[PDB]
From Swiss-Prot, chain B:
Keyword Acetylation applies: yes
Subcellular location: Cytoplasm
Taxonomic path: Eukaryota, Fungi, Dikarya, Ascomycota, Saccharomycotina
UniProt keyword terms in alphabetical order: Acetylation, Cytoplasm, Isopeptide bond, Phosphoprotein, Ribonucleoprotein, Ribosomal protein, Ubl conjugation
Organism the protein comes from: Saccharomyces cerevisiae (strain ATCC 204508 / S288c) (Baker's yeast)
Disordered: annotated segments: 34-67
Single annotated GO MF: structural constituent of ribosome
Protein name: Small ribosomal subunit protein eS24A
Gene this chain is encoded by: RPS24A
Family in the record: Belongs to the eukaryotic ribosomal protein eS24 family.
GO cellular component, one term: cytosol
Keyword Chaperone: no
UniProtKB/Swiss-Prot annotation, chain C:
Protein name: Small ribosomal subunit protein eS4A
Major localization class: cytoplasm
Annotated Pfam families: 40S_S4_C, KOW, Ribosomal_S4e, RS4NT, S4
Origin organism lineage: Eukaryota, Fungi, Dikarya, Ascomycota, Saccharomycotina
UniProt keyword terms in alphabetical order: Cytoplasm, Isopeptide bond, Phosphoprotein, Ribonucleoprotein, Ribosomal protein, RNA-binding, rRNA-binding, Ubl conjugation
Gene3D superfamilies: 2.30.30.30, 2.40.50.740, RNA-binding S4 domain (3.10.290.10)
GO terms of biological process kind: cytoplasmic translation; translation
Membership in a protein family: Belongs to the eukaryotic ribosomal protein eS4 family.
CDD domains xrefs: KOW_RPS4, S4
Phosphothreonine modified-residue sites: T114
Curated annotation (Swiss-Prot), chain D:
Places the protein is found: Cytoplasm
Entry similarity comment: Belongs to the universal ribosomal protein uS12 family.
Gene3D superfamilies the UniProt entry points to: Nucleic acid-binding proteins (2.40.50.140)
Descriptive protein name: Small ribosomal subunit protein uS12A
From Swiss-Prot, chain E:
Name of this chain's protein: Small ribosomal subunit protein uS4A
Localization per Swiss-Prot or TrEMBL: Cytoplasm; Nucleus, Nucleolus
Span list, region Disordered: 159-184
Name of the coding gene: RPS9A
NCBIfam families associated with the record: PRK04051.1, uS4_arch
Miscellaneous field: Present with 106000 molecules/cell in log phase SD medium.
Length: 60, 67, 258, 144, 184
RNA sequence: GGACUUUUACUUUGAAAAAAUUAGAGUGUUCAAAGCAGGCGUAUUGCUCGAAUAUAUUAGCAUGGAAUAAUAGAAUAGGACG
RNA sequence: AGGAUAGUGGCCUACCAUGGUUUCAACGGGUAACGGGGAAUAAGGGUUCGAUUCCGGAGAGGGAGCCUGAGAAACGGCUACCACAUCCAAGGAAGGCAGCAGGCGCGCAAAUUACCCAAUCCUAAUUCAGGGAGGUAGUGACAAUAAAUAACGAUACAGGGCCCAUUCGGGUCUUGUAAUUGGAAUGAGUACAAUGUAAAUACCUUAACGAGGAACAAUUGGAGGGCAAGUCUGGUGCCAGCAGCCGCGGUAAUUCCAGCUCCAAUAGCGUAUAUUAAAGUUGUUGCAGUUAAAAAGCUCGUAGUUGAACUUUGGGCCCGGUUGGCC
C-alpha cells in the first residue's frame, strides 16, 4: 500500500499563509462585567433580532 | 479580638506552672541557648560509641598518633 | 501483634469520651486498672475536656504530681488511670466530690456530690467464690475483692462499700421492683425498675425494665446495675434521672428554656 | 413463564446464567482476560514513551487522498514497534530521528480511528516539549 | 495518620451542555442578579435538589411519623428563618415548589440593591467586595450570604469605612494632597 | 425448681452490629467546604445549653404472630386417656 | 494410648480401622487479589473500585534457625546459607531506608538530605529526659470551599409614554452607544507595628505607599451536523491538513492555515486511558429467540427448579387505647 509519499510537502500551507498580524483592540472586560454586557447585548439591546435572533451575522 | 488570659496568685505559682516559652515571651526568664537538634543527636550518637569516660582511650590514641 | 499495644489513635477511642477528631493523631490510652478501657474515663480527659480545669496533659500532670486529686480515697497520680462507673473523685482543694455516672445520652456526667455521699460507692458483684483455706470472697465490677461477705450475697447483687476500709456496709438483692442503672449498650444511662427477668439457660439472661414514664425496654444482665428499690435510690441521681426524652420533647424543652 | 426460572430458591441458576452471558460481552471479557495487560502495546497505561525510528507517509483510506505523516517508534518498556500519527501541520519537522517522544491513544479505545489505516496512537510531546506549544511557538525544541 | 478533613462539592454541572432554553434562562438570572459564572446557579440548584430530595423522602413516609415531623419542622423552620419560604407556606410541598430565584432573592447583593444603598446589583457586588457593608456590626465581603430574615434591620455601611465615616479614603486623601500642593 | 416438651422457613419488635464516612438535628467557621463548637449576665465574683438521631445487609440471639410453603403423627393399632 | 505444648487437637509418635471432600463446583489453575469499615456513579434495583488517614492480618533482600524476655521465630536482635554489596597497611572487618529526609534506576507517573518536642500521645527509675511517632513550615493547579479582573456620574446620539396638541418646537422620567470627560471606591502588591508561633512564615488586624488603560491587560476549546456560535475576508487547491462519528478539501472550502466577529466554561479548560450512568446493548426488577444473533434432530431421564384442593369459620358480650366531634 502507499506507505511512501512526498514528505517535502509537510507544512506547505502553514508556510504559505501570509502573516497577518493581530489588530490591537480595546480591552474586553472579564467576569461579572462580561456577563452583564452579554445580558445587555442579548436582551435589552436586542439589536439583531432579524427573524429569530441570530448572534454572528454575515455582513449583508 | 478574642484571646485567653490567666492571672495567678503569685509569681512563684506563675513561674512554677507557666511554660518556659511564655515566660521568656514575657521576659521573666531567659531562653536558654541550645545547639540544634541534629547537632545534639550527632553528639549523642558519637558518645554511644565510647564505653565509659573514654579518658584512657583518649590518652591511648594520643600516644598512638605518632605511630 | 507481638505483644500488648500501648497507643490508642483518635477515631478508635470510645465515642462517649467526646474527643474531637482533630487536634492530634492519638488518644490517651487508659492504663490497666479496675475497669475495661472502653467503659472508663481517664483523669486527663475528665479534668481537661469535662471540667476545663486544664488545657494540656502537662497541666494535668502538674495537677496530679502534687497529690491534689484522689479517686476512691487513693491519690492515684497517674495521667491515664481508668476511672469507671460510680468511682468517686475527691478534690480536697475546692472541696469538690464527683461520682462518675452516665448521663442518659450514654456519656459520663459531672455529678457533684456531697462528702457523706462521697464516703461510699456501690459495686455489682461479678462472682462469689471460695479462696484459699476456705475463705469466701466476692468480686465487684471494679475488680475489688472483699473477703468474708454475707452468705446471702449472690451474683448480680449490689454491695455498699465503706471507701475508707474495703468493708461492706449493706447490700441490695436482685429481683422485681428494684431500681436499676443501665450500664452498657443502647439503653446506657436509663433507670427503670425491674418488672421481671427471663432466664434462657445457655447465655445472656434478659431483664425487662420500665422507667418512671412507663416506657419499657429490655437489657442483657451484664449491663444492669441495681442501685436500690423503687423510689428512694442509694445514691444521688444526676439531672434527668434517666428518662431518655425523645428528640421532639427535647427540642420542645430547649425552646421552653432559652 | 418468560424463559428464565422464577422460583424463590433458584438464585444459583440465574447467577451462573448471568455469568456466562456476561462472558458473552466485549468490555467484560476484555477486562477479565486482561488484553490490555497482555496484548496491548501500552500495557494498559494511558501514555507511553518511545524512541523514534523513522518517518512514514501513510496514505489515508478511501475516499480521501492525503498523506498523514506518521512515525515508527519503539517503546522503551516493551521494545514493541508502534506507528504514531503526528497530528498537526508541519510538526513532522520537529521529530527528526532518534527522538524521545510521548505517545497517547487517539480516543477510539484501541481502534484505528479514521482514514488512517492501522495506527492507534498520536504524538503529544517530543524531547520533553509539547507539539502544540511547538506548533504555536510558545516554546522551541531543546538541544538534541 | 490524622483524621482526614471532610470536604464536599457544592454544585453539579447539567447533563446536556448546550441547550438554548437553559442557557438563556440562566443568563437572564445572572444578568438580573449580578453573578459572574453559572457556578452560582449550579450551586443553588444543587442545594435545592438536596432540599427537594429530603422533602420527597419525608413525604413518602406518612404523617404522625416522628422522623417526618421532626425533620420537616426543622427544614421548614430553617427556610422560613432564611426567608426563602413565606410564613403561610409551611406544608412541606411548597418546599418542593420552590425555585432558585427565591434563594437568589435572599443574597446580600440583591438585598443591598433592594435596601437601595447601591442602585445596581453590580454596585452592591463591588461594595460588598470593597468592605463598605456590615450585616450586623461585622463586615461581610461575601455576596452569597443568605441573610437570616432578622439581619435586614442591621444591614448598613461599615463604621470603619467610607460612607460610614472615620476616614475619607485613599484617592480622596491623594486628591487632598494634590490640592494642598496646588495650594502651595 | 420440675415432667415433658413435632420440626422449620417467613415476618414484627428488641438486644447487638467501634469510630470515622453517609443521611440528618442544632450552631455566624464573616458566607461556605468545614468544625463541634458555643451562648448569656450587673462581664467587678460568674451562670448555662450541647457535642442528638437514623441507617448499618446476610449470618447468629431473644421475642409476638401464626396466614402462606413445607414437615411429623393412631392403620399387620407393640394408639391416647386412666 | 503416650509424647510435646501454656493448653485442645494427627500437633507428633506407636498400634488399629478405611475412612474424609465433591455438579448445592470438591480438587486444580488464574487474580494486573491483603480483607473489612468504606469510595465513585446511581429513580429504584445495581455496576465498578477499595495499595492508601481507622480496625485486623503478613513482611523487613529470599529462606531457615534461635538467645533474652511476661510478650519476638524480633530483624533500627543475633547465627548460617543464597543473591547483591562496603572498607582494607589483603591479615580481616562490617552489611540490611517496604522508618524520616534524600540519591540512582524503573518508568505516563508522585515533594525538603528544613525547624521543634510548643501541642496529641508514648516510654523510662520518671512532673524535669527522649521521641524524623507526631506537629510546624517548604514543594505542591491531586482533589475540594469562598471569590477580583471594575462601579457610579455629567456631555453627544436613538428611543417610549406624558405636559403642552401652537407648524417636526421644548422636551421633563427613561434604556442603550461614544478617537467624550470626571471625581470617588477598592484590593492584589510592598510594609512601621502589633497579633500569630517553641521560634518564625503566612492568615485576621493595621500606620505609610499602592488603577486609567500602552495599565494591575483571562485563559482553554470551538463556530456544517450531533452540539452554543459565520454563507465574513485572504491563502491552499483530493495538496497541506481537519475530522470522537457522519464527513470537508479536486481554483468561488460556512469543516484546512490565518485575520475579524461570535459562542461555551472560566482561574480554569482541553487531551489520553480506565470505570459508572446513558445500557431495558446482561435485562431479579427488566431483554430477545418465525424471518434481524439465537428453540438442542427427537424422546426418556437423575441432580436442580416448581408442584391440585382440603382441617376454627362465623356469631355474640364486655373492657379499655388512637384519630376525630360542637362543647
Ligand atoms: Mg496510657
Ligand atoms: Mg419457590
Ligand atoms: Mg432462623
Ligand atoms: Mg491425647
Ligand atoms: Mg488420634
Ligand atoms: Mg498481591
Ligand atoms: Mg494497618
Ligand atoms: Mg515481624
Ligand atoms: Mg528493598
Ligand atoms: Mg527474622
Ligand atoms: Mg531499617
Ligand atoms: Mg525513604
Ligand atoms: Mg480564542
Ligand atoms: Mg480548529
Ligand atoms: Mg447551532
Ligand atoms: Mg465512510
Ligand atoms: Mg467543525
Ligand atoms: Mg476559522
Ligand atoms: Mg436505567
Ligand atoms: Mg437486545
Ligand atoms: Mg436468524
Ligand atoms: Mg424443533
Ligand atoms: Mg428430578
Ligand atoms: Mg418441592
Amino acid at each position: 500500500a502507499k506507505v511512501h509519499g512526498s514528505l517535502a510537502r509537510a507544512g506547505k500551507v502553514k508556510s504559505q499563509t501570509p502573516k497577518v498580524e493581530k489588530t490591537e483592540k480595546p480591552k474586553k472586560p472579564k467576569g461579572r462585567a462580561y456577563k452583564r454586557l452579554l445580558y445587555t447585548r442579548r436582551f435589552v439591546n436586542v439589536t439583531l433580532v432579524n427573524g429569530k435572533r441570530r448572534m454572528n451575522p454575515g455582513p449583508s | 479580638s478574642v484571646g485567653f488570659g490567666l492571672v495567678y496568685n503569685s509569681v512563684a505559682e506563675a513561674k512554677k506552672f507557666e511554660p518556659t516559652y511564655r515566660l521568656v515571651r514575657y521576659g521573666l526568664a531567659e531562653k536558654v541557648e541550645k545547639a540544634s537538634r541534629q547537632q545534639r543527636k550527632q553528639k549523642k550518637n558519637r558518645d554511644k560509641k565510647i564505653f565509659g569516660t573514654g579518658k584512657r582511650l583518649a590518652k591511648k590514641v594520643a600516644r598512638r598518633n605518632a605511630d | 501483634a507481638r505483644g500488648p499495644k500501648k497507643h490508642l489513635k483518635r477515631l478508635a477511642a470510645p465515642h462517649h469520651w467526646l474527643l474531637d477528631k482533630l487536634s492530634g493523631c492519638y488518644a490517651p490510652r487508659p492504663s490497666a486498672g479496675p475497669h475495661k478501657l472502653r467503659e472508663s474515663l481517664p483523669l486527663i480527659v475528665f479534668l481537661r475536656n469535662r471540667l476545663k480545669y486544664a488545657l494540656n496533659g502537662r497541666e494535668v500532670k502538674a495537677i496530679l504530681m502534687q497529690r491534689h486529686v484522689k479517686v476512691d480515697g487513693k491519690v492515684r497520680t497517674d495521667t491515664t488511670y481508668p476511672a469507671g462507673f460510680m468511682d468517686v473523685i475527691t478534690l480536697d482543694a475546692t472541696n469538690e466530690n464527683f461520682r462518675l455516672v452516665y448521663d442518659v445520652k450514654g456519656r459520663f456526667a459531672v455529678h457533684r456530690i456531697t462528702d457523706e455521699e462521697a464516703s461510699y460507692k456501690l459495686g455489682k458483684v461479678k462472682k462469689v467464690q471460695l479462696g484459699k483455706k476456705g475463705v469466701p470472697y466476692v468480686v465487684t465490677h471494679d475488680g475489688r475483692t472483699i473477703r468474708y461477705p454475707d452468705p446471702n450475697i449472690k451474683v448480680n447483687d449490689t454491695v455498699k462499700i465503706d471507701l475508707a476500709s474495703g468493708k461492706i456496709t449493706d447490700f441490695i438483692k436482685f429481683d422485681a421492683g428494684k431500681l436499676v442503672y443501665v450500664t452498657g449498650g443502647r439503653n446506657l444511662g436509663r433507670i427503670g425498675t425491674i418488672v421481671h427477668k427471663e432466664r434462657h439457660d445457655g447465655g445472656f439472661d434478659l431483664v425487662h425494665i420500665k422507667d418512671s414514664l412507663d416506657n419499657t425496654f429490655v437489657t442483657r444482665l451484664n449491663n444492669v446495675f441495681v442501685i436500690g428499690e423503687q423510689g428512694k435510690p442509694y445514691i444521688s441521681l444526676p439531672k434527668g434521672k434517666g428518662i431518655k426524652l425523645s428528640i421532639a420533647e427535647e427540642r420542645d424543652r430547649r425552646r421552653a428554656q432559652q | 413463564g418468560k424463559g428464565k426460572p422464577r422460583g424463590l430458591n433458584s438464585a444459583r441458576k440465574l447467577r451462573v446464567h448471568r455469568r456466562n452471558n456476561r462472558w458473552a460481552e466485549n468490555n467484560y471479557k476484555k477486562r477479565l482476560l486482561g488484553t490490555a495487560f497482555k496484548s496491548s502495546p501500552f500495557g494498559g497505561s494511558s501514555h507511553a514513551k518511545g524512541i523514534v525510528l523513522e518517518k512514514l507517509g501513510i496514505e489515508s483510506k478511501q475516499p480521501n487522498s492525503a498523506i498523514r505523516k506518521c512515525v515508527r517508534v519503539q517503546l522503551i518498556k516493551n521494545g514493541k514497534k508502534v506507528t504514531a500519527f503526528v497530528p498537526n501541520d508541519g510538526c513532522l519537522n520537529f521529530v527528526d530521528e532518534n527522538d524521545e517522544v510521548l505517545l497517547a491513544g487517539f480516543g477510539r479505545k484501541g481502534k484505528a480511528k479514521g482514514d488512517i489505516p492501522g495506527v492507534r496512537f498520536k504524538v503529544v510531546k517530543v524531547s520533553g516539549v509539547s507539539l502544540l506549544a511547538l506548533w504555536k511557538e510558545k516554546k522551541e525544541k531543546p538541544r538534541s | 495518620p490524622r483524621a482526614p478533613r471532610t470536604y464536599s462539592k457544592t454544585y453539579s454541572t447539567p447533563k446536556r451542555p448546550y441547550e438554548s432554553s437553559r442557557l438563556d434562562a440562566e443568563l437572564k438570572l445572572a444578568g438580573e442578579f449580578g453573578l459572574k459564572n453559572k457556578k452560582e446557579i449550579y450551586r443553588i440548584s444543587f442545594q435545592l435538589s438536596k432540599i427537594r430530595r429530603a422533602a420527597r423522602d419525608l413525604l413518602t413516609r406518612d404523617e404522625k411519623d416522628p422522623k417526618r415531623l421532626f425533620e420537616g419542622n426543622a427544614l421548614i423552620r430553617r427556610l422560613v428563618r432564611v426567608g426563602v419560604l413565606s410564613e403561610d407556606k409551611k406544608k412541606l410541598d411548597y418546599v418542593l415548589a420552590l425555585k432558585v430565584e427565591d434563594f437568589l432573592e435572599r443574597r446580600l447583593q440583591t438585598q443591598v440593591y433592594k435596601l437601595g444603598l447601591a442602585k445596581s446589583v453590580h454596585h452592591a457586588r463591588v461594595l460588598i467586595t470593597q468592605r463598605h457593608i456590615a450585616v450586623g456590626k461585622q463586615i461581610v465581603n461575601i455576596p452569597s450570604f443568605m441573610v437570616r430574615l432578622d439581619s435586614e434591620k442591621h444591614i448598613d455601611f461599615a463604621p470603619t469605612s467610607p460612607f460610614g465615616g472615620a476616614r475619607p479614603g485613599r484617592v480622596a486623601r491623594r486628591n487632598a494632597a494634590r490640592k494642598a500642593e496646588a495650594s502651595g
